[PDB]
RNA sequence: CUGUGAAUG
């Protein structure tokens, strides 16, 4: 810290701005707190002019402060003041700030601190200028690195949240490329980007404000991304991170038409295998909970009768799943769904049929199996829940098998 | 006999 300031209580902001030493204060733990308090006061027109010039008016200083642990806060603060100061330099200032960021977009996105300057600009700038920042995003392998970066992934998520889809449609098609989807989806941060894109592309209650034309644009982008997801959903559903994306599609009511596509193309005929997977068993659970009734019947039939019992012991698919360390959560789900249906906590009407009598059949199968195996089941936390679940109803009312 | 997901003072 410069010696002429040592920090005196009578230090004024104008002193700091006039001295040429603002960069010294801005990168200093104590000096930045002074500037943070100062710029919150009633600034004269010239004080603002000096701040605009010295904080967001000089490209190299702007980058040094934006990439600084303390200076990035001063940058965001001055950006806010510049956007709130509607003088005759307003248009020029915002244009220059867009140019500074655009010219260093990728490096700023990857920086722990400068990515906060990006996000604050995206949501605070006038929409027309914020859309220009989005155009400065890269389109090659650097975009993959941005989506899987611990910092830069939040830049993409911010774009998706505050910028209309027309501006970032290239990101949807970039992610949907089979080679790119595999890399991004199986990453801890990339999977958050994909899930955030899917939610923004959903016609849920947070998109009812869209015009018809923007709804059509959203629907077409959703269909392109859903095609790539459902094309490698088996790989996605078993992955430690991408299984959350499959769960989200299967469980979200506003993605109903895709839940049936995912179930039929990925989970059907693989329920026994996927029920024994650490990550995919959660997907199977969601599918049972949310499947349409016509499909749920096929899923139940696959568990009860889709596999040939073991030729030596007679162990069948239900026995494997009911006692498996992950499969038991699927069987519990099946039992809970049936008990909810017969007790009235779940409706049973679909497609012109009443499937009440079908839930009765599945419950009777499960009750009969649980009754016969009650002694083995009573050893386990899962078995005790299943027994308890059936008792509450009476009061009120990886090994593979040969598939069929 | 219980079973998995984000980066600044």
Numbering used by the authors: 168 to 173, 179 to 569, 607 to 613
Paper text:
The PUF RBD with eight α-helical repeats recognizes RNA sequence elements.
To explore possible roles of the FBF-2 CT, we expressed and purified an FBF-2 fragment containing both RBD and CT (FBF-2164–632). The electron density map revealed new density, not present in the previous RBD structures. This additional density appeared near a loop in the RBD that connects repeats 7 and 8. The sequence of FBF-2 CT residues 607-613 matched this new electron density, but other C-terminal residues (aa 570-606 and 614-632) were disordered. In the FBF-2 RBD + CT/cFBE crystal structure, the seven visible FBF-2 CT residues (SLMLEPR607–613) align structurally with the core regions of LST-1 A (residues 32-38) and LST-1 B (residues 80-86) and made remarkably similar contacts to the RBD. FBF-2 L610 occupied the same position as the key leucines, L35 and L83, in the LST-1 A and B PIMs, and like LST-1 A L35 and LST-1 B L83, FBF-2 L610 was seated in a hydrophobic binding pocket formed by the Y479, L444, I492, and H482 residues of FBF-2. FBF-2 RBD residues Q448, G478, and I480 contacted the peptide backbone atoms of the FBF-2 CT, LST-1 A, and LST-1 B. Thus, the FBF-2 CT contains an intrinsic PIM.
